[PDB]
Nucleic acid binder design. Sequence first.
DNA 1: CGCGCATCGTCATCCTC
DNA 2: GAGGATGACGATG
DNA 3: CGCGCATCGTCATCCTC
DNA 4: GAGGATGACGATG
Lengths: 760, 760
Amino acid sequence: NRIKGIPKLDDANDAGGRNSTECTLILTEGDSAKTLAVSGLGVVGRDKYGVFPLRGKILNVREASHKQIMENAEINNIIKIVGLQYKKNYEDEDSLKTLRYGKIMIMTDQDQDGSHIKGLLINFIHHNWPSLLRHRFLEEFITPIVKVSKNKQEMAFYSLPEFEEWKSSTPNHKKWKVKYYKGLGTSTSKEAKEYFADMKRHRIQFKYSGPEDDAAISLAFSKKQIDDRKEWLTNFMEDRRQRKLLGLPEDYLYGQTTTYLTYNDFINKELILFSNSDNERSIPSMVDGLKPGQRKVLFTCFKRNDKREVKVAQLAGSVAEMSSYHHGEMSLMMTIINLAQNFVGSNNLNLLQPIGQFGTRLHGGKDSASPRYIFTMLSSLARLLFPPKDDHTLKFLYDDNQRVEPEWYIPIIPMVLINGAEGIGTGWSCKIPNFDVREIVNNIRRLMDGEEPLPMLPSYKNFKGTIEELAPNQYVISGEVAILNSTTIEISELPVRTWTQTYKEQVLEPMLNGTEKTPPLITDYREYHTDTTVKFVVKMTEEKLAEAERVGLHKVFKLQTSLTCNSMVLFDHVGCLKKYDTVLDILRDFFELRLKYYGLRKEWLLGMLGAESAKLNNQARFILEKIDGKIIIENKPKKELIKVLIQRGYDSDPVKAWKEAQQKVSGPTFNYLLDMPLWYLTKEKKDELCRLRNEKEQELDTLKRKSPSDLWKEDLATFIEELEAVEAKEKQDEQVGLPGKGGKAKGKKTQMAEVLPSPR
Amino acid sequence: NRIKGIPKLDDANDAGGRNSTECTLILTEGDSAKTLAVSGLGVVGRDKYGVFPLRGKILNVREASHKQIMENAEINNIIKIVGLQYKKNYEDEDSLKTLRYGKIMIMTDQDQDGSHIKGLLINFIHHNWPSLLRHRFLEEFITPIVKVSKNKQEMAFYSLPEFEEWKSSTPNHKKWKVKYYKGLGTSTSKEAKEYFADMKRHRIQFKYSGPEDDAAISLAFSKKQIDDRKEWLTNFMEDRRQRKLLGLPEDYLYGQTTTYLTYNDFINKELILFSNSDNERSIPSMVDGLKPGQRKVLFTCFKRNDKREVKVAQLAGSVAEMSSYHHGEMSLMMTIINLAQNFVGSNNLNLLQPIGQFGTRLHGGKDSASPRYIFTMLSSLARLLFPPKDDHTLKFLYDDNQRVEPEWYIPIIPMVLINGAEGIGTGWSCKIPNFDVREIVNNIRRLMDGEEPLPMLPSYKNFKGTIEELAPNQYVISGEVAILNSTTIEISELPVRTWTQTYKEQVLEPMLNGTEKTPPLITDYREYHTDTTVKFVVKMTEEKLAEAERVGLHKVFKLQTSLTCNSMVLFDHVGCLKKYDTVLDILRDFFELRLKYYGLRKEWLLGMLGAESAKLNNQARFILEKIDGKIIIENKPKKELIKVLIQRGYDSDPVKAWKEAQQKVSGPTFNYLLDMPLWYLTKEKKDELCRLRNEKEQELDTLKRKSPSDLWKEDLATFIEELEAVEAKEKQDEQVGLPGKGGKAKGKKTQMAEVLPSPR
DNA sequence: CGCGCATCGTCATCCTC
DNA sequence: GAGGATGACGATG
DNA sequence: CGCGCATCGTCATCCTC
DNA sequence: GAGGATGACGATG
Ligand SMILES: COc1cc([C@@H]2c3cc4c(cc3[C@@H](O[C@@H]3O[C@@H]5CO[C@@H](C)O[C@H]5[C@H](O)[C@H]3O)[C@H]3COC(=O)[C@H]23)OCO4)cc(OC)c1O
Ligand SMILES: COc1cc([C@@H]2c3cc4c(cc3[C@@H](O[C@@H]3O[C@@H]5CO[C@@H](C)O[C@H]5[C@H](O)[C@H]3O)[C@H]3COC(=O)[C@H]23)OCO4)cc(OC)c1O
């Protein structure tokens, strides 16, 4: 009785023989954990140790079809390794002895990712074998997350709140050399030996008491308890907000040694952190509409200038190095590719430039090449969207004592209304279609005036399809068809979410031949597709055309598309989630949040210009004094020079003062009055400085004269000019994409008016 | 008759039916070529087009065992796709019609890599079916390498000599916008349409006339014609040297349209370039002993400072970006890993620092983690090995109008004698064992004195094994065994090339049990292996120990290792290959090449110090003149100031003069006399400058007084101090690697003296 | 260096007793 | 006792 | 994101009629 | 003619 199916399994010495109850099956996530286990178990033993590497997410068997259960080979092989039988109750001790193993130990990192794997495993086990949750069948192995060392003294920490309490309870901080442990590649064999030297500290079992815990086990895995999970997340968010406001430290686990672990606290304390993290990283906020990955990428791009092009794979490492990215490399490259996509039906305004094959509009749009095959370059719109002067507005986080990206940004327009926010998280989701960019400026101007803004319509770049709204939060999108002759027909325009391969396989194949129930509808079809436009030389029987007209062209060819927008939940500026009703309310909230910052920017600009103004004034006064002549330069000591500078009414460095009043808002400094070359002593330099000192005075007087209003329009004027330039470049690209072919012929076309089923 | 084995094959419409002679099978290297073909053939057609992607190198069937032929599944599937039969002659037209295809078109890039694939394919076909080389069975598809564009005017170029002739024949260079085409990811569908628009230009067939060409076909594929290939490479190298000396341009192919292609020119012109490139990139030179990949990595590392650590995957992109690396990413990361390995038996002096798991000495040393899992940091020895002042000695290449790495370097010691040169190329190879680093300094000192240097012995870091040389260019290496008791035995030291897993599987398993012919030799064994040391608690019958002693301990346990060093072929400073005889001759040649550069460095340093010396002298004179006072600073025009500076004997910028005399070796410049701040007018600055101007004079007088000799020893003194510091750090690491265990017990040990078989 | 299984939740079709 | 067969190998496809 | 086949040539074992 | 079943989906394992 031995396993020979997969070679990756570490067959134990007693796996299949005597002492089946003492056989231990270890599940290791990822693949580096397998190497760590092979390197570490060489000292402890090999008899009661069978290691199996894990791939990743586990298929949820609680809600799946019978065909779906037999799909993943690995899940099926788990039974072959263990020996489970669905139609047999494992209640008697002999039934437990029958199994090839007696205990299952799973090990994960201190991150929240392992919580999902543990929950999926508990679901897979309890869904068919609840009675096995009381016979010491499951246990857990843990790892450290951070270690401090000073003078050969090490301390173990397994929780971030534990580390925070250690910092709050110990004096002389920044003395213990700190070392983070984000992944498995950091640990070595010498550390694994110490890890396996103490089993009572890491090898911790579980405990089950009362059926009520099973309800919690079902809480995160029931499709009928969505509102219950919503209330659960709401209670947790309220508790966290109250604790942060009161400043009381939260609770954590693994403070001292533990033998068992209750399921109720296990669900209420560990998996909830993964749920909160997934929700924070999945859906963007309403202020800037940017996800944390896009935020890190854009911040790293802002860090440099990037005048020339740059590789994607090379940029991903630079982003991960400074943004503290700890989610592999594939996800970041995928996010960069999604930011790079700008074809029709995907986005309306990108932050990069299309260089290479970023996926066409024919086959899924995901047929792009390797990130190193393709190149990229920053766009010119980002400079106007995020002005650099806004760097002094938001407060950055402090991780690793490093200046990192902020929590959000302040754009000139809501990005959710221009690129769409499609986020799927726990408790809620977000799906907002695109709109027109030209109407946004008119709406903002009308709102600045104080009039009721007109209702908007979902628009797309390079899309001539009309959209009519019958019921609120519901939209119908149809394409355009051209009838050249009573026999020939051509589809002019396709609606959103229409891929060439999918539409072909789902429409042309059933219509071409006679299916099991439908006669062959079409007689001929051709696909002269260009890079962006489509062509359909399709022939049809004239008699069948009348029936198609009576039924409906959009109905027969399936050109109609219905969408509903109800999940208007976004992260507020504070951090809460509120289900919204209309777009205009979101625009008004953004307008108020933006109005709050005109005074802040004005206060930051006011006085800052005055600082350099006074500095130049003092420099000019020093030059005039030198022209008159009182300060002897004949090897005078610096002490007398500083004394004269103080006695003659010369202030210190204003830039130093503004820098000092930034963290929380010897003696005098006069380096700037002595770091000036002799070129200042020339006539031309003095003449140009005499007006350079007034060039700043003009702007200072204008700022003292101008109001906080009338600035948004002046800022938008340059943006509209740049947008017209970008549209001219797009028209030039269309001229480049012009082969020299003839224009589309005019033909009869109609749009069907679907009866309103009064849905919702 | 259809193919259903692999889904990757693009089944043609006529593949298996009528018109078998007209069926065309296309072989595409890599995987991007398959996407390019799918994107391009959509316009031309799909009936007579069957595309198959290629994996890479092809197994050589001309010299392989019968078992080896049936190993690669892809090679076997090639027959299933085509329909070849080994025991059937395809001479009659009906036999050609029987095959599923009539023509084979292969396409590769303009690089030399495709030449190897084409040669392997020609070998695979001709080895069993020569008669098929005369019936239009094979053809070729080509791609561009570079394109120029200006004012909507494009020109195609397929050869680097063609591009050189175009540059030499056309005026107004740097006007046509150039675009390189190194790989397949650069080309787009719009370019593929133009590529397939002209078949007569790219689709070129072949021609065979006379059996003599077959000899050339065998020349690059015969294991008995090694000397013939050596003469062939020698003739080509001599011809290239003569053509470069005479300045005559070489010959190239694809100048005009061609219908056929002779095999003789095909072998003598295209594959020879791949052979030369592989030979240039495989074996390092004798001057620095660094391969081009190591050279690019080290140059990129020199470009930056790298005070902190850095990732390997992140560094690889930065190396590829500046060094013009066009060989993927895996090879560069593998080269970095090889540079990072410093364990016993691999290297003696690395250029990096071990951070992470770089592979242990237990399982092949190739069990390291992902390049992003591990970190790296530059060592401190590189600063002394390659002084920055040597940057003005060698002339860098000019690729893409960019300053790139040089062709070689000038180290203080020959790297081949400290890290080994193991290169395998066409025509020759190189395998040089390691030696002792301490003896190199003594040998160099003795050579500088003028005495005959003592013979050296191959040494290794942390290796106590003795080596005795009986015959020249031959070495015997043995380990050490400890006999604790008449029954117990332990192996103290293992010889070079001894891996724990391999030695165990090849020695302990046959000795433990009774094999088909040998009784069980050992009775027990234990493996208490540490990170570096080994332990063997092995028991043996006392009676069998006497027989083992009579036969030989090194002989029975296979502890002896024999190696011969005969391939002493290295690239000379000129570029030629000369088979060397002894190491001392190599040391003398390196000593002469190094002596040639003392005068060059002295000439570069002489005058350069004088330039800043005169500059500081002029600055001090200007300060003294200002103390006396003649130059009025009252808004005087710059023209009068320049006139006074000229009339008072003040020279221009010497740094500008040295910069001008570097490429081939308004009016005056006085910016440095006016770019000085007022701090120079202070007493302390003047007092410190009065001695700073003489600090350079002291070194200048010392250089004028010192000789070109006595500099190498002074340079080596700091290097020996740093080497002692590095060895102290290694001893500190050994103290870190000290668990606290007891020392190895003293025991009887012996080294066998093998009889000399007088080999070679 | 291309190959491949899933998660959270929301919704458009869609088909049969 | 000697010649064909088996792997060691290091950059690249 | 780990999985896997080869090339150029040189040489150490190595084993059987 | 209505309710359970099937995929669309976007960041990560
Ligand atoms: C191999 O070893 C491990 C794999 C993984 C998974 C994974 C799992 C897979 C799988 C593929 C992958 C792969 O992701 C895939 O990338 C693809 C690239 O973008 C587009 C094309 O499509 C993506 C797939 O949607 C995604 O699934 C890995 C990337 O990083 C991960 O986290 C992924 O196909 C089969 O099951 C986790 C591990 O432990 C931490 C492992 O040890
Ligand atoms: C998948 O598609 C393609 C693959 C290739 C080969 C390749 C071929 C392989 C194969 C693996 C590989 C892989 O290299 C492997 O890296 C490994 C990593 O370092 C150590 C561990 O061991 C190396 C292998 O020795 C090497 O073989 C590719 C890396 O870049 C290449 O050039 C390699 O295993 C099976 O056959 C070329 C192509 O066309 C351009 C392709 O389209």
